[PDB]
Design a protein around this ligand. Structure first.
Ligand SMILES: NC(=O)c1ccc[n+]([C@@H]2O[C@H](COP(=O)([O-])OP(=O)(O)OC[C@H]3O[C@@H](n4cnc5c(N)ncnc54)[C@H](OP(=O)(O)O)[C@@H]3O)[C@@H](O)[C@H]2O)c1
Ligand SMILES: CCc1nc(N)nc(N)c1C#CCc1cc(OC)ccc1OC
Length: 162
């Protein structure tokens, strides 16, 4: 049906600014999570491991390959092979995976979002604007600084054909 993917974009990195990804409008995260609470969320064990997170969306699913392994506090998922079909399991599904994951999830994603932040230093995953022609933007929204977020950022809407 509809596959949504959420990914950030560090001005000096790409996603891993410092073992984890930045954050903005901590309030919006609650409103959306409360209204979406129940939607499937796919994330990488590496990112979920460093960050941890309790149970945002009451459906935190981490993709990891290791038979006989189980992570308490989160659901275990298989490679994109499983997620591929799991998609048809729910109308609108959210995917996060990570850097490498997003790459292979390119043909599996229908609509993607990118958030460019003007703040990043020494991280784990760096990848500046090298090639994004594969995608086609349709809308772009700007953000604004704040007390909890003294950093300026911008929201972008990426859409695919398939
Ligand atoms: N900007 C953002 O909003 C955002 C989003 C996500 C992550 N991040 C950050 O990205 C940092 C590192 O990300 P990363 O890209 O290096 O790793 P990652 O995307 O977070 O996760 C790597 C996963 O890819 C899986 N994988 C790779 N090749 C595979 C294959 N052929 N078959 C099955 N599974 C495969 C591995 O599974 P196994 O190792 O279990 O076999 C591994 O768990 C994290 O610290 C996280 O904080 C940021
Ligand atoms: C703004 C944070 C956010 N908003 C929405 N709508 N969806 C998300 N998946 C996220 C996120 C994130 C990463 C993250 C989560 C976390 O527990 C909720 C703690 C730290 C995090 O890294 C900043």
């Amino acid at each position: 049906m509809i596959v949504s993917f959420m990914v950030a974009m560090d001005e000096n990195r790409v996603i891993g600014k410092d073992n984890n990804l930045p954050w903005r409008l901590p309030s919006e995260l609650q409103y959306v999570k409360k209204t979406t609470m129940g939607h499937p969320l796919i994330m990488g064990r590496k990112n979920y491991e460093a960050i941890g997170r309790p149970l945002p969306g009451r459906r935190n699913i981490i993709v990891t390959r290791n038979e006989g392994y189980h992570v308490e506090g989160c659901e275990v998922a298989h490679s994109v092979e499983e997620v591929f079909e799991l998609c048809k399991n729910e109308e609108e599904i959210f995917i996060f995976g990570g850097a490498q994951i997003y790459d292979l999830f390119l043909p599996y994603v229908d609509k993607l979002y990118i958030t460019k932040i003007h703040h990043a230093f020494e991280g784990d995953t760096f990848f500046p604007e090298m090639d994004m022609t594969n995608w086609k933007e349709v809308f772009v929204e700007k953000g604004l600084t704040d007390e909890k977020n003294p950093y300026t950022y911008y929201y972008h809407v990426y859409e695919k054909q398939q």
